[model samples]
Target: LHKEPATLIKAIDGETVKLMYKGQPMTFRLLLVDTPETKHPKKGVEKYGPEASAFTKKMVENAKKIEVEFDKGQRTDKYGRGLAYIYADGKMVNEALVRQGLAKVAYVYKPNNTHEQHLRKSEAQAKKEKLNIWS
Candidate 1:
């Protein structure tokens, strides 16, 4: 929506973040990949959710630049949060998390399967290695 890239204010969990978009603050839900839930009221903290959140926070903090790319399939969910693919330091944060076993390939909707294959492959490799959540 804006020419300038968004700046991450904080990671709500592992897959969500509050960011500055077009000089305004907005919540963004990362597309494709899904990290475990750290704050689910019913489910409570899922296994590895806290570690995933920590990893996301660390990744964002270390980022030199951040970018948000919206997909045409779905821009927002019922919650009205922005749905996007986030990049940090020129790498897709979603893929990184999946590769690290902190997240999994979760392409629940149609048309937004842009990076599904890569993410699945990364997840498979992570599972094979028994890394993080996979362990």
Candidate 2:
């Protein structure tokens, strides 16, 4: 029901992004997905984290249209960042990342599992193809 229009501020990484959502400055942690950290002080940058980040950067920066989606369950985090999905040029970046082995289907907020099947199928594709993480 909530697929509000938004534009990129930046892709924080593969799974996190900041955007101008609902005419307000907002940061969103893409829901139900996990990606490696590009800037983890302790974890020290997991392999391909930078690669995922770069892919996200290009997709958002080059997209002509962007939108933010909120599932019916919880929204936002401790930082007030939204927990949602991102669509660039009509493609869900969360699933895109999963398909490319950049992200894994995770944080299954049961109330917010509208896209679970899509994510599952995408991750299967990456695994079968032996993509980045799967490789």
Candidate 3:
């Protein structure tokens, strides 16, 4: 990707953003999870939803720089574009999300063993704290 100013069209969460890069809009779901978030304007918010969403916004807004890592896993899942686990400095954003109990770990194929273990650890903590949405 050519270096261009990253524009945040809407601040969705500390880690996620509704952004337009060079005028092409895409929803950047950051890996930093902290709880589920209010997803719609009318729908009643679920537990942890607002906290998670706001957490994402806070992280991104404070990010002075970001680095993206790929290839340790795969580039794109079946969805397309590129599959990425974002990082702020050395911190894994995806892992942060799961650790915070905002997003659950999901994979489309085989096992994402590389990421699964830490994510599981995070899940356990979230569950213990009753951060899991289903809890």
Candidate 4:
């Protein structure tokens, strides 16, 4: 359905993680969304950053299956992390994070904007509910 599947090596942050891609370690940055910064040296930890990281780690760890769906528009970010929409057990992990208020809609680039509307809608709902970071 999406791109090839990969084993989640670890969650580096709320929106970044290490994945086993084709038997090699690769960094993956979730597209169309941005989580609070948990590891920014200068910015320091932002509000809800730890919570977002924990939520992401839990979700990735519990997923029955994980896959990385690359955006047809782009392949990787400036840092070289693969740009993708992560799917866990058939559910979009990026959207889930937004829906849960763990992340925000950050359509930074155009080409990798596959589920733009869906992510925006989810963020709106999360904001309305005052969930997680929105609170």
TM-score of each: 0.90, 0.95, 0.62, 0.92
The per-model lDDT (C-alpha) reads: 0.83, 0.88, 0.56, 0.86
Superposition error at 94 for model 4 (Å): 0.5
Model 3 regions lying over 4 Å from their true place: 1-26, 30-37, 40-43, 71-74, 77-81, 111-113, 130-135
Compute the lDDT of residue 84 as modeled in candidate 1: 84
Q: What digit string (tens of lDDT, one per residue) describes model 3 on residues 13-104?
A: 54456655547766555432334547656776767777777665666567765545443444444544434455545466677767666777
Q: Give the poorly placed runs of model 1, Cα more than 4 Å off.
A: 1-4
Task: Please write out the lDDT profile of model 4 over residues 4-39, one tens digit for every residue.
Answer: 889989899888989998898999988888888877
Candidate 3 structure, TM-score to reference: 0.62
Best first by lDDT, ranked? 2, 4, 1, 3
Backbone clash pairs for candidate 4 read: none
Superposed by TM-score, candidate 1 places the C-alpha of residue 39 at a distance from the truth, in angstroms, of: 1.2
Which is better, 2 or 3, measured by TM-score? 2
Worst 10 residues of 2 by lDDT: 1-10
lDDT of 1: 0.83
Each candidate's root-mean-square deviation in Å? 2.2, 1.0, 4.9, 1.4
- How much is 107 displaced in model 3, in angstroms? 3.5
